[PDB]
Amino acid sequence: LALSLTADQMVSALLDAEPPILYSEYDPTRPFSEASMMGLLTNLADRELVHMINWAKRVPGFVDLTLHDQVHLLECAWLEILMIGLVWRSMEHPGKLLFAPNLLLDRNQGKCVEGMVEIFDMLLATSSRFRMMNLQGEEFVCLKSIILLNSGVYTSSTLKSLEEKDHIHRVLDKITDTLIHLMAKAGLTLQQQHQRLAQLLLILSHIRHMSNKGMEHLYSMKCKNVVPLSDLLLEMLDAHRL
């Protein structure tokens, strides 16, 4: 059980669970078409997904869940997690989005993909939000592990399914603890703590919206056969249509 962790221990194990920033298929030798763009991002993600499983296994408590529960959550949250990850990346790049250090995009470079710019501007706004609230690395990791453990928690039968849900709720309660402990150490008023906590978690429902619309177009692209999805990326989608 990972309940037995102090706030500090929670933070450290999350900051060093962190995945590596990846690079996009570099020197593009062809103008941007809808097909090409969607190949860069799809190649990126598909590679990012392998390190997400790794990072997930290292999120305290995660491993205490059973395979199908672990599949469920990851199947549920992969694109939110990708998108918060992105948002964070693009932190110090206002008006741009660092998908990779060598794929730094602004909004006019979504004009070619049906649905991009819209999703792009939401991700841009969120970046602004974090900058404005000056989100912190240690808060960031907490947020993202929340998204992992939370997104598919509900979507119960005998205390095995049931007690499995008290468990991730404990873990989640812990992340809250550790989020307030961080806000206090940064010397915030108790009134500012509960207001900060709330604003931060409200963005999580905007991320959900991010992922859902993104998933929608991602399905439209697939059936229009614009880009060749990986087998893993095939199954990540097919969970949001069944």
Binding site: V50, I53, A56, K57, L67, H68, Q70, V71, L74, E75, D231, L232, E235, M236
Partner: peptide
Amino acid sequence: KILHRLLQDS
């Protein structure tokens, strides 16, 4: 079952 496999990896 790609996902499932990948988590099953020790």
